[PDB]
Amino acid sequence: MLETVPTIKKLRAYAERIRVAELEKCMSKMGDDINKKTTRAVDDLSRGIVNRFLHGPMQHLRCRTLSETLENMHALNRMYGLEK
Amino acid sequence: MLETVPTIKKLRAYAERIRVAELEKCMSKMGDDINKKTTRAVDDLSRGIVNRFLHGPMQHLRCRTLSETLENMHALNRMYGLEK
Amino acid sequence: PKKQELISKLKTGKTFLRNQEPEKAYTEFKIALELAQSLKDPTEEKKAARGLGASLQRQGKYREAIQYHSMVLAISKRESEDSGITEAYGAIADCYTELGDLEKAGKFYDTYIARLETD
Amino acid sequence: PKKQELISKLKTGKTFLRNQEPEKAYTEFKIALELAQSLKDPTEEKKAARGLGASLQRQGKYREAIQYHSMVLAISKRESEDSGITEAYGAIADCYTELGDLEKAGKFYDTYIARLETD
């Protein structure tokens, strides 16, 4: 249903803020050890962790009673402060 | 309240399975580029992302009406399949 | 070679984007896009395309942003190389959401959710 | 030096733990603990202590596991070095949860939640 769509967007952005922030700190702490394959590997790590974390919640934000889907949305809103 | 305590434990283990799995794949893809500071940096990255992700939910699993806390628990249970 | 300039243009564009300068960044990624196309390097063409998409969203030009994120899909199909695909699907969905087409955004989110565990 | 053996014992113990062998791993971390203490290396002593804690939990010996995870806290206090602290707090809470003391587990979780954003 359409009502949870913005929550999906907001949760993506929340996740990404964290991913980028930590990925940047990591790269800074590696100095001259950054090369293509190493850089690519750490990038894949950052989004690999984020994506596998986001899968459950976001799968459950779509398509199951509509009522539980809304509660999943509300819980996310509370837990991550998506609706400031 | 005590009822959400096991969910916290289960969510920690769920998070860690993902963190370890991805961290291991990352290290394998770096070859000989693994040295102390580089290894430490990527480890800090893996748990930095996980921890900042887990903070919201787990803070909201403790101490706010008790009713919302239980719903946060239920939503997590559904989203991450904590209660198999 | 000039591959050198391509690397520079991508890094520069990524820097301008990180410093609240999407217009300046758009200029850089645009050059990088031309370079990657002229150099026939699809992998970097997808990166350049994403940079343009990101620069445009940042400017609020979501409809134009979709055109550039869609390239990532198009290039990937022409090349059978799926890097950036998952992010592209999600970005496009983000754009449609900002445009009010929640129906179409949901369809792209669905495609993107289905990839969240694969790598 | 023998620092060489310490590195080996930590890696070996970590390997046995990954391969469903907590007893063999306990033996390795135990040697590493003695080595790190004899070498006066607190940083590695905390790592050795965690390995023992993990090996014990894996065996279901949660009460003994707490004793070794608590060392990480103790060593950290004696040294003003806080690495492993957050994980130690959480592991101890996991142990009390497995022991049925949900009250005490909650207290340790609370301490651990409060660190989840700091680094």
UniProtKB/Swiss-Prot annotation, chains A, B:
Induction: Circadian-regulation. Up-regulated by light. It comes from the Eukaryota. It is found in: Plastid, Chloroplast membrane. Strongly expressed in photosynthetic tissues. Detected in all tissues tested. Part of the FLU-containing chloroplast membrane complex composed of FLU, CRD1, PORB, PORC, CHLP and HEMA1. Interacts (via C-terminus) with FLU, only in the absence of light. Interacts with GLUTRBP and forms a heterotetramer of two GLUTRBP and two HEMA1 subunits. Interacts with CLPF. Belongs to the glutamyl-tRNA reductase family. The N-terminus (65-92) is required for heme inhibition, but not for activity. During catalysis, the active site Cys acts as a nucleophile attacking the alpha-carbonyl group of tRNA-bound glutamate with the formation of a thioester intermediate between enzyme and glutamate, and the concomitant release of tRNA(Glu). The thioester intermediate is finally reduced by direct hydride transfer from NADPH, to form the product GSA. Catalyzes the NADPH-dependent reduction of glutamyl-tRNA(Glu) to glutamate 1-semialdehyde (GSA). Probably involved in the tetrapyrrole synthesis required for the chlorophyll biosynthesis. This is Glutamyl-tRNA reductase 1, chloroplastic. It comes from Arabidopsis thaliana (Mouse-ear cress). The chain holds residues 440 to 527 of 543 of the full protein.
UniProtKB/Swiss-Prot annotation, chains C, D:
The gene is FLU. TPR repeats lie at residues 6-39, 46-79, 86-119. This is Protein FLUORESCENT IN BLUE LIGHT, chloroplastic. Negative regulator of tetrapyrrole biosynthesis (including chlorophyll) in chloroplasts, probably via HEMA1 repression. Inhibits especially the magnesium ion Mg(2+) branch of tetrapyrrole biosynthesis, but independently of heme. It comes from Arabidopsis thaliana (Mouse-ear cress). Disruption phenotype: Loss of ability to restrict the accumulation of protochloro-phyllide (Pchlide) and delta-amin-olevulinic acid (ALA) in the dark, leading to a strong Pchlide fluorescence in etiolated mutant seedlings exposed to blue light. Rapid bleaching and death of plants transferred from the dark to the light, mediated by singlet oxygen production and enzymatic peroxidation of linolenic acid. Part of the FLU-containing chloroplast membrane complex composed of FLU, CRD1, PORB, PORC, CHLP and HEMA1. Interacts with HEMA1 (via C-terminus) only in the absence of light. No interaction with HEMA2. The lineage of its organism: Eukaryota, Viridiplantae, Streptophyta, Embryophyta, Tracheophyta. Signal peptide: none annotated. It is found in: Plastid, Chloroplast membrane; Plastid, Chloroplast thylakoid membrane.
